[PDB]
């Protein structure tokens, strides 16, 4: 009971990276989409990319802690 | 009128449309609109066609100059054309059209 | 690089001018093509020309219709049948011919007519969308 | 496929009604450019 | 019971950050193709995404409240 | 059983926000890449914008109503 | 057991409404971009809109009332 | 545990219905995005639109009828 | 718990039928805005709809062939 | 309880087929406004389909796996 | 309590994948469509496909990691 729901509790917390995983290939889809529309690949675009799969990795990371603070 | 009246008597029977009062006023746009107007409002869906004016050079020189249209929408789409992209059917139906008016108004020009 | 090409039938801007991009008002929306966009054929509509020189300064116009075209190699032209720059145009007649225009919309019923007064209704109201 | 399609108009009966609400809008300072551009001298022949 | 209950059910409030991550890849990927047709990059589109990720992170942020109100 | 349950009944309601969470990501994702074909920004689209952020709060006020009686 | 299990049965059934608030917004954001190729606002994108929201939103209906069922 | 985790399993097998209304809002978005293009409204893209929402809804039928099987 | 555990086993998996709901929701929509291209609508596109409709369908029929398993 | 969590956990698993189930749909239905756009159908562009499906059913035999490691 | 909630650990941490999988089908997707309007195949935006079908799975190896710790 105190050793069990803090070991299946940190199994669901687990199922926050799945917005994470599939919101990463979107902000890296729309780059290869956007990238083929053309030119301005190296900054503005793929300078953004990076703006745009770290505010979607801080919800992954915020995640993370949560199944993290369940097992440790 | 000097084209209905020089290249007539031979090709009588082959005539779509004759236009007056060219080289009266110097030509515009909006002459050449006219023209785009009354080709596509003939029920004659044409394969290809070409177009043959006087193309200056300087003031006594000049050179008779063919410049062949391919206006068929159905010609629209060719295997060149698939190296285009983000096209539509009914896109190049708005484009071919005013493409048309452009060089009617260049040969008149 | 990419060589640029812009007129009207009256009066010639640019000549395989080096421009880095150039944003115009076409049927699907405003298309935006830099220095190696893709082929893509497009024809225009009444409303605003960006065009991005090589010197931070950009130059803006304004189009009635006509045609963009973009090639498989860096080269872009664009034509109109009338084309003025956003100095000439008095912002008072635009607003005159407007409501005179959706005056003349109610008052036809006629399936050709309609099209005709709609059409000078779009191009007047693109043209507040500048001055 | 837009309004003026269907409508029974082509682009170049479009293309023309655009120019024309773009030269009444004008100043009198380019008006003359009016006058040079927007043509109809040409006849229509039909035998 | 009183205990065990709310370590396995803060676990599951976790999962409502899914949203706000696979959002953000599409509130920022929207923005990527949108600058792409460009121009109007600092002001209008860019100033529209800042709205939009602060209406997708907010469903963050408010589920992050319910986790941490089943654990403190 | 009764009051043991209660903890993890609202955990999982909690996570009917993911809904909300990408769908406001989309909605004014796509009112960003609407806006970039241009020019009716105010009102017609970004006024449809606040119809359609409100149509997807909407489950969002309504699943949030739902883990609130199951807590108090 | 009988009023155990029940409570952490309408909590699962409220995650079935996930789909209706990222439904309603893939459905009013596709319209927000219809308009944006214009002009047929209140006329028939907006209308068939209305038959999109009430297509999926009923979606959210029949889980809505799986989520009723096991709590009356 | 018998009479029990049943009504805990028709809870879960509900939550195949985010598939059923986040299905129709990509179906009838697609059908509103592409009626923009025009002027294909009747007998092509909307009757489509008929066999796009019925291979939908499908999967939320054997969705509702898994969680029926559970009740009943 | 041995009788218990197959009727919260056999929900679980019926979960997975909401990824293949919607996979049909997007192969349907981009066809349904792949015929607004034209004009090609027999065979090519909507000949690859059912193509594309029977790999997004597999999931859900191995899916619900792991939920009948657990209930018979 | 351990003859019993392996059939409430084997189930969880399946619900992992969610992003295989719509990561085909999203990776055939832009092939085919991608076929739509034309015209390299046989080869290049359908071809990289195959490998578009291969990489979205190999985060599907994954999750597949797991939960026939957990049932037998 | 000990021997049981590891194997309810490991199976709600397989529904983390289910990013990866649907986000893979985003970015190969938008790489098909991509490579439509052409011309950098073999080059620039194929080799954009590769970093995003990495990041996309780098949830999906990351998830997978803590599916195996549960388990072994």
């Not at chain 1, 503005?44 to 992954?60: N, P, R, T, V, W």
């Not at chain 2, 066609?49 to 063919?66: A, C, D, H, L, P």
């Not at chain 4, 009444?24 to 229509?44: C, H, Q, R």
């Amino acid at each position: 009971i105190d050793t069990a729901a803090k070991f299946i509790g940190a199994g669901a917390a687990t199922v926050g990276v799945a917005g994470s995983g599939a919101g990463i290939g979107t902000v890296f889809g729309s780059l290869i989409i956007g990238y083929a529309r053309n030119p301005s690949l190296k900054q503005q675009l793929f300078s953004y990319a990076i703006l745009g799969f770290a505010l979607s990795e801080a919800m992954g990371l915020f995640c993370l802690m949560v199944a993290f603070l369940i097992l440790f | 009128d000097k084209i209905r009246s020089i290249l007539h008597r031979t090709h009588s029977d082959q005539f779509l449309v004759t236009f007056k009062e060219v080289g009266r006023r110097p030509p515009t746009f909006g002459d050449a609109s006219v023209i785009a107007l009354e080709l596509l409002n003939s029920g004659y869906e044409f394969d290809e066609g070409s177009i043959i004016f006087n193309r200056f050079r300087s003031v006594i020189s000049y050179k008779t100059e063919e410049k062949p249209i391919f206006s068929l929408d159905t010609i629209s789409s060719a295997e060149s054309m698939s190296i285009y992209d983000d096209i539509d059917a009914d896109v190049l139906r708005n484009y071919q059209e005013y493409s048309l008016a452009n060089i009617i108004y260049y040969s008149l020009k | 690089q990419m060589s640029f090409t812009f007129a009207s039938p009256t009066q010639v801007f640019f000549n395989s001018a080096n421009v880095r991009q150039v944003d115009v008002p076409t049927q699907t929306g405003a298309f935006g093509i830099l220095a190696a966009h893709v082929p893509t054929l497009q024809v225009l509509r009444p409303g605003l020309v960006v065009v991005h020189a090589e010197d931070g300064t950009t130059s803006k116009y304004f189009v009635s219709s006509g045609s963009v075209t973009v090639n498989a190699d860096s080269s872009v032209q664009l034509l109109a049948e009338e084309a003025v720059t956003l100095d000439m145009l008095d912002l008072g007649a635009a607003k005159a011919n407007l409501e005179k225009a959706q005056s003349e919309l109610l008052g036809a019923a006629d399936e050709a007519t309609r099209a005709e007064i709609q059409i000078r209704i779009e191009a007047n109201e693109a043209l507040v969308k500048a001055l | 496929v837009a309004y003026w399609r269907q409508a029974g108009l082509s682009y170049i009966r479009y293309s023309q009604i655009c120019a024309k609400a773009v030269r009444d809008a004008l100043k009198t300072e380019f008006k003359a450019n009016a006058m040079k551009t927007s043509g109809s001298t040409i006849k229509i022949v039909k035998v």
